[PDB]
Amino acid sequence: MVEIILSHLIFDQAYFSKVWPYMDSEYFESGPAKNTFKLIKSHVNEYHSVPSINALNVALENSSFTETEYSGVKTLISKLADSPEDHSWLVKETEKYVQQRAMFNATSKIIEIQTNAELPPEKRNKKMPDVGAIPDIMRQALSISFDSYVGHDWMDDYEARWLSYMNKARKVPFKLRILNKITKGGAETGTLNVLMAGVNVGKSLGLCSLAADYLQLGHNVLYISMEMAEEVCAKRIDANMLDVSLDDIDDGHISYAEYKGKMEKWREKSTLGRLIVKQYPTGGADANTFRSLLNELKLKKNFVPTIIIVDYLGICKSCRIRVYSENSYTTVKAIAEELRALAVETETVLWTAAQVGKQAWDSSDVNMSDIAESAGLPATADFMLAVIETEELAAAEQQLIKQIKSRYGDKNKWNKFLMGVQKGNQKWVEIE
Amino acid sequence: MVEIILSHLIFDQAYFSKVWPYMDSEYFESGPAKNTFKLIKSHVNEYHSVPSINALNVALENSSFTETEYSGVKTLISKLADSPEDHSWLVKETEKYVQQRAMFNATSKIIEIQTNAELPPEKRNKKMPDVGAIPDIMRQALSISFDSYVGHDWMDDYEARWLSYMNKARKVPFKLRILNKITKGGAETGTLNVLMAGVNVGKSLGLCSLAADYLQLGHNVLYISMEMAEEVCAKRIDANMLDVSLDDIDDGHISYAEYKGKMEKWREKSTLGRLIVKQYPTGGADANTFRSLLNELKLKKNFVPTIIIVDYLGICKSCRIRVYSENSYTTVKAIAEELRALAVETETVLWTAAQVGKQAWDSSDVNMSDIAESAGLPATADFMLAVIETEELAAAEQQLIKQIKSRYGDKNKWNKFLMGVQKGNQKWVEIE
Amino acid sequence: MVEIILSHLIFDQAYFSKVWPYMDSEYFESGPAKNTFKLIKSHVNEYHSVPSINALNVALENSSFTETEYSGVKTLISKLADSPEDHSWLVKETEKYVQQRAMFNATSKIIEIQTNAELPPEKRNKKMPDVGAIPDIMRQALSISFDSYVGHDWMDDYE
Numbered sequence A, B: 001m002v003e004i005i006l007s008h009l010i011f012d013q014a015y016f017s018k019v020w021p022y023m024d025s026e027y028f029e030s031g032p033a034k035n036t037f038k039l040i041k042s043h044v045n046e047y048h049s050v051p052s053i054n055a056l057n058v059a060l061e062n063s064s065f066t067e068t069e070y071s072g073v074k075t076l077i078s079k080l081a082d083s084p085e086d087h088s089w090l091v092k093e094t095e096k097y098v099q100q101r102a103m104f105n106a107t108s109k110i111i112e113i114q115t116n117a118e119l120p121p122e123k124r125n126k127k128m129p130d131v132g133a134i135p136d137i138m139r140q141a142l143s144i145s146f147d148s149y150v151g152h153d154w155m156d157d158y159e160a161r162w163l164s165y166m167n168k169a170r171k172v173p174f175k176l177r178i179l180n181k182i183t184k185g186g187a188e189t190g191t192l193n194v195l196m197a198g199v200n201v202g203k204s205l206g207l208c209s210l211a212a213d214y215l216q217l218g219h220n221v222l223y224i225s226m227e228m229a230e231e232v233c234a235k236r237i238d239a240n241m242l243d244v245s246l247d248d249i250d251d252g253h254i255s256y257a258e259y260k261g262k263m264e265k266w267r268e269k270s271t272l273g274r275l276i277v278k279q280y281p282t283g284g285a286d287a288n289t290f291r292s293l294l295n296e297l298k299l300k301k302n303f304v305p306t307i308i309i310v311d312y313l314g315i316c317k318s319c320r321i322r323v324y325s326e327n328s329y330t331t332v333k334a335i336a337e338e339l340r341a342l343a344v345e346t347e348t349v350l351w352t353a354a355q356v357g358k359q360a361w362d363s364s365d366v367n368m369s370d371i372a373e374s375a376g377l378p379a380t381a382d383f384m385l386a387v388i389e390t391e392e393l394a395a396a397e398q399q400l401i402k403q404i405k406s407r408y409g410d411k412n413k414w415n416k417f418l419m420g421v422q423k424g425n426q427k428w429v430e431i432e
Numbered sequence C: 001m002v003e004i005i006l007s008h009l010i011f012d013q014a015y016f017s018k019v020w021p022y023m024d025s026e027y028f029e030s031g032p033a034k035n036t037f038k039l040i041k042s043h044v045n046e047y048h049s050v051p052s053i054n055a056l057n058v059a060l061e062n063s064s065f066t067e068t069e070y071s072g073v074k075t076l077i078s079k080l081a082d083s084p085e086d087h088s089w090l091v092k093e094t095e096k097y098v099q100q101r102a103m104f105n106a107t108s109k110i111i112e113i114q115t116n117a118e119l120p121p122e123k124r125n126k127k128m129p130d131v132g133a134i135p136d137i138m139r140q141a142l143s144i145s146f147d148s149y150v151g152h153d154w155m156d157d158y159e
């Protein structure tokens, strides 16, 4: 159907619009199809437009190949004729053929590599790499995305735009109504949000609490904590979910039997995702490490998170800047940018906590300028929230939540709101 | 391709003002092609207008030739249709063919003079120049080109630049009286313009307002954003164009009936351009990718942007520098220079927004030195706008836009101008 | 490392316990190693215990075959020792080797499938899986590794 592929590329604009990038000369033939595709792609990169049949002939005249393939291409361009088909079945056929041919090429090369490796040391060649090439080429043939985007035309793409407007998809709601109503839709996927509380002001508690909340919403959660060990956070999640205690996890006031029973009674609910907690040494974690983690999760554990959580992003490493070549500001901003880029590249909700300078420590109000490490990070951040705990407020077993950085709407809509933080149970709740 | 150029001269009026002068009878052929060119050139000489096909066969029968040549010209005149291929591709192919024929006739001249050189002087013809007259002819053989690569010639092309000064030269109206006033012609093509402002002040709203104005002016707009986009600025364009406040969009006030009506109504308007909004990862969209994006836009779509917008800026991650620059001076300035150079190469209006340092995050007035980005960036700029929003300005829902880097005009007597920035509809409303 | 693998399976207990199901008859060799590990698995299944050298010798004696490989199988069980090496290094190397063997087997099977495809359809053994089965085994080839157990899951790690 390669003739059909070429014809629908040439005479149909939407067809070429669908899949140009996954078109490559080694997908067609060792003869006329490859040569004509090469000519077409040369035109593509030379003039940045769809060649006309006349343009095809023009390029054909200024050719270098000899007579036989010249006549073959002439016939093929003569064979190039438009036919009426559908916008859907053609996609399925073209992809099927792409996958088939990619697998054929990969397996052909595999045979060549195997043969070379079978030959005696004198007879074999360094031209064909060793068997080590067998696994990498195979995964390549299976890493073709078959899916690409171009951008959102404001006029041409209003249908799905209104579909989103009514649907409000990609904004995952919270389990607490105050946050949903101040965000008006919950939390967007490619978003990074930070909390500023201070030192032992409820940071990790809020992080694990929100992790549990989203996990209860049938969601794949990733809670990567560096300052806190996975087991410690596992215990915090035990306290939040099982709702027994933290002071009872140690000096166990609860039987293993009832713990197991409530564990099973939570296991039956399909309304719960998968959450795995990972820990790394301070300043030894980078975005590339996180990406490789995601890759191996999908490969071996077939897991892909959506609400990825990083504890105190400020103790990661940029993987670009050399080792502490500057102060906190630069590396902090760079890490913020890198992690937000990864999150939007994976559409995974990103949350973290930022330090507060000693000037705002033990203060009833915290401002944006009260940030400790950097100011580029507040620029990079979306929907920063400030958690304040006062002696009276702590005695009320609550904290005050203020908006310092808004993205989903007005900041002054509901500036002050309280959380019933339970240090004992590791869970904050609305006061209503 | 002779038929192609003939048909385009006959039919494409646009392909007659670009290059008529570089048409010569000896370019075409020894066959009927030069005869047809002589016929049409004679018609152009007698009547300064493109003769029609009937006028063409009238000249053919009017002019007397051999039966073989009569039939040959008869076949050529019988092969001419519109066939609207690419303008740039057409002109480049014609340039290539003209160069080919120039070299061909130069080769004929040199071989014939060389053959005439060896024979005795009695057999020599006084008409042929001596063998020492080869280079200038070869020079004038290779001097054949269409572009004025010589560049401007002062005191000689003063007519063309006078026509430019008369009315408006290469420029784009801002759709607002005050902006065009302070530019006196709007913004010029190929110029690098920046709109620096504070974090969350007037930046994205201004970008969307300008994009909406340029689209309403029928221009092709390309909004490349490193922030959240394809749905976020898209909603802002909905607010500016459809006059629907964002909160209404979120709450679903529209019934999708009036939405569809407005969309198709704007589709009815012929004064609307094409706008493509594309979002790319933070730190991975270089100028090289930018050019490839332009190529893809022109390939998959019939789109060549007239205006291009950038968000936040400095996110291009220019490949010129491998590592982050300490103060980002080299990197940011390189990005700005590449943007301006690309705009020149495309002769397009490029807009972006710079960052303001922490020193002026709350200052009632912003100086040029109040630049979070590099100091070399406010040197490659051509039009540096700066907006400030204060509590008073928020109360008035206005701003205090200030002009700097006034390359278009003088940076005086207009800097104290204010706009009714609409926080609900994402647009600028200059006071009348 | 088949010597080391068989020695530690016989001798080391945590070695056997760690990844026993991660051991297939085709992981080892087309020759005497396959037969010896067949005896190993036979004694494991018949007796839910770690066989002694004498036990497997008795098994090979009673469960015999033609003498051409009988010498090979009897001499193969003559070298397995204690050899107190590193457990982590052991499991890493074994996983690497088993991945090599899985790649080899998937490759060869794809070779056979294509070879039958590179044959007149009438003269093709219908029993063999067809070309459409070629991609999936590739996935099956790559979806073979030891559980690193990276990270902790709050739910299934309650034990």
Ligand SMILES: Nc1ncnc2c1ncn2[C@@H]1O[C@H](COP(=O)(O)OP(=O)(O)OP(O)(O)=S)[C@@H](O)[C@H]1O
Binding pocket: A198, A199, A200, A201, A202, A203, A204, A205, A206, A227, A422, A423, A424
């Ligand atoms: N181990 C603990 N024992 C008792 N109470 C605790 C313990 N950990 C936390 N709390 C209480 O719960 C609150 C919330 O602490 P977390 O948010 O879990 O930690 P954190 O504030 O992120 O810690 P750092 O060290 O400042 S990053 C604390 O301020 C205490 O009131």
Ligand SMILES: Nc1ncnc2c1ncn2[C@@H]1O[C@H](COP(=O)(O)OP(=O)(O)OP(O)(O)=S)[C@@H](O)[C@H]1O
Binding pocket: A378, A379, A380, A381, B197, B198, B199, B200, B201, B202, B203, B204, B205, B227, B246, B312, B389, B423, B424, B426
């Ligand atoms: N839909 C909207 N409703 C109300 N105000 C809006 C809306 N969109 C934008 N604005 C206002 O316009 C500005 C939007 O932020 P910008 O000035 O574009 O800064 P920014 O690009 O978000 O900055 P950073 O540094 O990248 S977070 C702020 O003053 C907002 O209050």
Ligand SMILES: [Mg+2]
Binding pocket: A203, A204, A205, A227, A228, A311
């Ligand atoms: Mg913490």
Ligand SMILES: [Mg+2]
Binding pocket: B203, B204, B227, B311, B312
């Ligand atoms: Mg913005």
